[PDB]
Structures are given as C-alpha cells and as structure tokens.
Design a protein around this nucleic acid. Structure first.
Length: 49
RNA sequence: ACGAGAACACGUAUGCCGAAGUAUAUAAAU
C-alpha cells in the first residue's frame, strides 16, 4: 500500500537490457479477448516467446 | 656715489626583492 515506496524508489537500481537480436522479434495483432474475441485495428512489434 | 658687487640648494642614485586566485565538494533524486 505504498509503504513510503516513494522513498525506497531511489535505493533500488535497474539497468537497461542487453541487446535482443531480431530473430526474437515478431509482429502481432492486438486481440480484445472477451465473450466474443474481437480484433483491434492496429498491430505491434513485440518480443517473441 | 644703496654693508655693496659677482654666487643654479647643485652632482649621484627609483619603489625594488620573493610570492600559484589557491584548498575538497555527482547537474542530482520519477
């Protein structure tokens, strides 16, 4: 419940990621999973499985 | 025919001689 997590935010440091080669990149369609699976108009580049 | 008349307070040398605008302290926490 934000245990002053604004404070601890400074004391834990995360580096950026190392490179990810292309063979692990894919294009996917955004799908609205619901009672009837819908399809969003646009697509995305995202990391593969 | 004036206790008068003549007589450069002159001539030599300079502000020097050594020193550091120096001493640490993240353009920072989303």
């Amino acid at each position: 419940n934000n245990e002053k997590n604004k404070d601890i935010y400074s004391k834990i440091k995360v580096s950026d990621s190392k490179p990810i080669d292309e063979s692990n990149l894919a294009i996917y369609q955004k799908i609205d999973i619901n009672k009837s699976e819908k399809s969003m108009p646009l697509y995305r580049e995202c990391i593969d499985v």
